[PDB]
Structure formats: structure tokens, C-alpha cells
Amino acid sequence: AFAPAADPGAAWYLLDTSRSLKPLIYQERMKPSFTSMTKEDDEQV
Amino acid sequence: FAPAADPGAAWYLLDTSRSLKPLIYQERMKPSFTSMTKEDDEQV
Amino acid sequence: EVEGVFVRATVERRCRAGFCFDKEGQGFADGVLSDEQLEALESDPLLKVERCTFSG
Lengths: 45, 44, 56
Fold this sequence. Notes:
Chain A is mostly loops.
């Protein structure tokens, strides 16, 4: 003892590594399914 | 011990079964349903 | 935190005093303790399931 941070970049390990488990996928509900849009007012989530 | 002596030789047999519907598989593996909406991708 | 509650104002199977009922929304998903008894308490969400973590 705001909190800055000093990080190297030369080493091929970079701080705060990320893991992209799966590529971004856009899901939808155009299919004739789901309750909150049929039973309940349309939501077309 | 609930045994059942049976002749099983007459025109009918004891405890006859009644096959109405086969074992049609029911599945819930698509985002179509509210199980994956209300829950963490729970397929059934 | 709490992984999940799955309450929807309904427990899976809260069986007490020799009778099994369905109420009080005591659904958990974690192996903190009583996993063997957690199988009996859980594993029967007759009604819909709504998961709203309490962050406990």
C-alpha cells in the first residue's frame, strides 16, 4: 500500500491469461418452442 | 414370498401385459426449451 | 457463493417422519456435505426449476 500494475510483455507468457473455451455463438428462439414466448407474451429471445 | 403357481396353458396367461406404446425416446438437448433458458443449459 | 438453488418455490423431495413431501424449496447443487443424503433430498424436481444463486 487506485491500484496500477506493471507487466512485462517480452516473455511469451502474459499476465491475466485468457481461455477462449468456445467460439462466440449466437443462439436464438425462432424455432416453434419455448414457453415465455408462446404461453407468455411473445419474447422471441 | 409372493409366489404364483401358474398353468400358463389356457387361452390366456396370468398377469397378462398390455403393450400400448413403445419406448419412444424423449429428449431435451436443444435451446428450444425453457430448461436451458431458466437453467444452465440443462438437457433432459 | 451458491452454485444453484433450483427453488422455484419447490423442493425436489423433502422426506421427513416417514412421509415424502414437496415444498420449502431446499434444492442445492454442491458437494459441501451430505452428498449421499443430497441424492435423496434432490433428484426429483417434479415442477419447473428456476435457479437463482444466493451468493452465499
